[PDB]
Amino acid sequence: KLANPAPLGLMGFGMTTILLNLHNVGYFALDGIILAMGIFYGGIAQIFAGLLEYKKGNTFGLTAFTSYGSFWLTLVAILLMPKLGLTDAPNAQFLGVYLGLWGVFTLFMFFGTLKGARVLQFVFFSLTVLFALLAIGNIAGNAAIIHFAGWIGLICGASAIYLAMGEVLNEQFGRTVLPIGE
Amino acid sequence: KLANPAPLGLMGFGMTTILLNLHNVGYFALDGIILAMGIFYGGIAQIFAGLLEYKKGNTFGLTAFTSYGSFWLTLVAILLMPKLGLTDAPNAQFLGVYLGLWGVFTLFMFFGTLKGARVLQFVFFSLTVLFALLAIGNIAGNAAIIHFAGWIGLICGASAIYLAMGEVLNEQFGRTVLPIGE
Amino acid sequence: KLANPAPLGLMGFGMTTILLNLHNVGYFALDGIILAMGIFYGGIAQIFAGLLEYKKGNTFGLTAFTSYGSFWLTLVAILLMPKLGLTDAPNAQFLGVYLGLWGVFTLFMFFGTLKGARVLQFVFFSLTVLFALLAIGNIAGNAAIIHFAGWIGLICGASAIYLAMGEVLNEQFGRTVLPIG
Amino acid sequence: KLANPAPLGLMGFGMTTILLNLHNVGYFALDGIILAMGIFYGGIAQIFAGLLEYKKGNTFGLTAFTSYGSFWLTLVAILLMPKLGLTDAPNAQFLGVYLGLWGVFTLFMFFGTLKGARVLQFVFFSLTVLFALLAIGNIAGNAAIIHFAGWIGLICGASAIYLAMGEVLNEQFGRTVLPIG
Amino acid sequence: KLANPAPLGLMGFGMTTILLNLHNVGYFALDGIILAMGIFYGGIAQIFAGLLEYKKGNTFGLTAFTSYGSFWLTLVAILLMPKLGLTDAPNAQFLGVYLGLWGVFTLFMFFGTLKGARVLQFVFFSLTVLFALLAIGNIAGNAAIIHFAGWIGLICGASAIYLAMGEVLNEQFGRTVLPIGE
Amino acid sequence: KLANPAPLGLMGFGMTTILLNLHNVGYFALDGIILAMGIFYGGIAQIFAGLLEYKKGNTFGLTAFTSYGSFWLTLVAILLMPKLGLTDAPNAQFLGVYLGLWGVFTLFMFFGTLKGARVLQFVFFSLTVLFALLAIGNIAGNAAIIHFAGWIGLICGASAIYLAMGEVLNEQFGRTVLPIGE
Numbered sequence A, B, E, F: 001k002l003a004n005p006a007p008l009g010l011m012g013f014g015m016t017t018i019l020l021n022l023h024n025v026g027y028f029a030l031d032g033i034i035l036a037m038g039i040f041y042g043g044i045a046q047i048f049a050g051l052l053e054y055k056k057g058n059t060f061g062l063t064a065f066t067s068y069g070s071f072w073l074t075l076v077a078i079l080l081m082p083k084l085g086l087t088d089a090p091n092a093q094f095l096g097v098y099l100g101l102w103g104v105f106t107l108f109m110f111f112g113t114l115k116g117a118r119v120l121q122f123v124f125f126s127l128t129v130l131f132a133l134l135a136i137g138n139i140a141g142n143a144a145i146i147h148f149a150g151w152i153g154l155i156c157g158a159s160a161i162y163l164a165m166g167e168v169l170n171e172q173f174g175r176t177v178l179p180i181g182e
Numbered sequence C, D: 001k002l003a004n005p006a007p008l009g010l011m012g013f014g015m016t017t018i019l020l021n022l023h024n025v026g027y028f029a030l031d032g033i034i035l036a037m038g039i040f041y042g043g044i045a046q047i048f049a050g051l052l053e054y055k056k057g058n059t060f061g062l063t064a065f066t067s068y069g070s071f072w073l074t075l076v077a078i079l080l081m082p083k084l085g086l087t088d089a090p091n092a093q094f095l096g097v098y099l100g101l102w103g104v105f106t107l108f109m110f111f112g113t114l115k116g117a118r119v120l121q122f123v124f125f126s127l128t129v130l131f132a133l134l135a136i137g138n139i140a141g142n143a144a145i146i147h148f149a150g151w152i153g154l155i156c157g158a159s160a161i162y163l164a165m166g167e168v169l170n171e172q173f174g175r176t177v178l179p180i181g
């Protein structure tokens, strides 16, 4: 009877992850498109979804969605505080360690997805791999590893968008029109 | 007992979409009017609508209304972050890829409207079409395709404003005074 | 048991509308008085009223009060985003089309007041005339149309204040001390 | 069972008015002290109080506390948008009309207090007189009326504080330790 | 069943009062440390505590915590609006009259603590003396009274911290580990 | 039935603490990464966690998460109000007293964890040592103590993440997959 906020948070997260990984692949630069999306949709909208998981019983969704929206808000801030002259750019090795800490949080949360749907297990698996590769590629500096991570990132966003659209549509019809792997 | 937030969310979205596409048709430039409406009515007020669907059972309206207010916030942000020297203008091919992803989101969400009224299915069809044409016209650079999508947006906004005003007025009289193609 | 938010929203709307039409009539310039009131009283305070109508059963008041406060916020944003170098001043024609869109919303919402009190039907009719005249007076450029609309706006705002004070004053006494019909 | 939000809103308004009229009486200039208080205590904190009247049954308190908190926000915005290069200075005739609009709102809300406590009736009386004289003194320009209006405001503000500490202290003791109506 | 928000408001108030009075005593200048605390802990967090007293039955705490969180916000604003060129520094005597009004508010609220705990009566007594002395020392120009007010303020802050930790620790253990004076 | 907000608050606190102490250890400078995390994850997200403890019965979690979330926001404000020309950098002895005040708050709240999980007791033990050492290293000026406290801080940050992921994963599986010493 309380709506499911998981699709909103999953859409917010997934769509924004794709755009950032279109840059990481190399097709585009880290644009105001990625930044605006990280502010309002991958951040704010996902924080909303996470807070709405509270009156549902969902500690995982509360812990997950809220944490990743906060991640997108930190990321946009790291990129935009220099353009405001408050902080200097980041150190990519420090940027690498930052992305690594978010990686282990996802690693633990993966074990939390094991009784849930199978698409959900995949988005947490792929997201751990994405963060891992970016942690390596930024600490050592390999542009190649970051290009490979980018392709893993595009898949991650597509999975999360599908899972969200899976949830919303199965609820809408009453039967599982899009397979998820419950 | 809980009010219907859909007319407000539809009004905010619908009115702001008309204004933006009066520019896409070519009659006007991308003004602060579109930006102001995109901030407060197509964005915030629709975000209110999406959040107010939560205590209703409406996962769809929560997912829908909340995401499009966020989109309008991202759009104004992409256009105004350059004026602030935070970001450089954006790649239109990236803008096209951004607008296309929102089209894929609406496309799935249209399939969710299949048991709902007819106008709602129409707004989601034209809105799927709107995002598609603009994404095409922006990746390739066809001013003609963009002038055509502008006309599709004008009808689309008219549909949502009509749907919103239907719902509010059908509720008020107790009989369905405005046809919504239930 | 839940308080009535309509007087707050009507007060915010009405008072803000009077002051803005004191400029549209011509007695004063488009001041920070109008701009402040448009930010906090006709905009924010009315958005509260609209949002407080939600746990009540009131879809009309939710959609109406919330949309008009948002209008006042967009209006102030259109008038103040230039002073900040974010947006060029706006073409009046659009303003007319923008005020015209807000007019059509008000027209439909007028048909929605047909089972409510009488003063409420009047504020929504006169506001429909107000939005309509301004849309015309701005697309065409008639200063005269805008001077007349201002007087329609002063009457509209005074009506919303009167209705608001009716509801609050009728509720307090137990009889309809102010006739609202 | 829900806490009483009137003492907070009364405190926010009352304390802020006292400070502002120490300027209107003439003791001080219109300081940033008044502006800070107008932002956070007579403004935001009272808006909280107004909104907290909603789940209580109190439409009068909702409408009043919420409207005056917004009023204090509009005034600070009117005084500070010039220092920000947004709004030029305000027109004193218009400010008088603006304070006049806020004056009529208080006048009606005064008639709503007729079955309520006695001190509450006084604060709305003095606020009505306060707004009236300031509108008079501002459209007309008598510094003396405004110096006189200020002295009315110090009494108005001191009374609202007195009512607030009454409400809180009478509830706390269970008997009326501080006399109110 | 609702948490007790009083310890949060008492912590914010008390810790911020100590810091400010390390300056009033003379050890330090009115540093940004005092101002940061005044914004977020003595101001914002205490306003949270105050709003949380509403669903409890607690009008005193609602009226108290919410007003003093606002005081700390007005205090920061008085000190930071000149650095923004919005206001010219305050006059003192007006500052003294301002702190004098907060003293009269605190005085009445002291009579309200007479059925509450004994330490609670003390924080309101010493705060009344704190505001009184600072009002005098600022109207009269005595650096000496303002140094004396500083030491009373250090005690006032320490009481609130002890009281807060009594409340939290007594609830946690089930017996009164720290004496308060119920 | 209300989600457990402790993992969110614990994640926010811990992850951000690790990074700030990667600076205290000496590997990195006080980056925009540390500032971004302090704003959104160690600050906002933890205030969220703390406020959600209210409808649960948890006065301790309310007092703790909200106060620390406020701490990161004051610390970010201390580091950023100078970059804006609002305040002058802090005096390190005054910072030391400020961090010491947060230390006594943590010391008392430690006594509040004695019936809780052992890891919970550990995060409060190491956090008390962390504040005490940093308060000492800044009052006296020992860079060495601050290099050592940084190591104690890293351990502390690790615990809070471990406890957070313990809580989430134990609820999710139904058995204690990760030991927390209940």
Ligand SMILES: CCCCCCCCCO[C@@H]1O[C@H](CO)[C@@H](O)[C@H](O)[C@H]1O
Residues within 6 Å of the ligand: A006, A009, A010, A013, A058, A060, A061, A064, A065, A068, A112, A113, A115, A116, A120, A123, A160
């Ligand atoms: C992309 C990272 C942001 C989203 C993090 C994943 C959100 C997972 C929410 O799903 C919910 O998880 C629970 C697990 O059992 C189920 O109770 C519930 O039914 C399922 O719907």
Ligand SMILES: CCCCCCCCCO[C@@H]1O[C@H](CO)[C@@H](O)[C@H](O)[C@H]1O
Residues within 6 Å of the ligand: D006, D009, D010, D013, D058, D060, D061, D064, D065, D068, D112, D113, D116, D117, D120, D123, D160
């Ligand atoms: C103070 C300046 C104007 C701001 C708003 C003041 C409104 C105070 C509301 O009062 C409340 O009204 C109820 C009926 O009116 C009474 O039950 C009660 O006596 C009183 O608690």
Ligand SMILES: CCCCCCCCCO[C@@H]1O[C@H](CO)[C@@H](O)[C@H](O)[C@H]1O
Residues within 6 Å of the ligand: E004, E006, E009, E010, E013, E058, E060, E061, E064, E065, E068, E116, E117, E120, E123, E124, E127, E160, E167
């Ligand atoms: C110094 C400014 C901040 C101080 C504000 C203190 C208000 C706290 C109110 O006390 C709380 O109210 C009841 C009695 O008040 C008790 O039952 C409750 O348990 C107690 O915790």
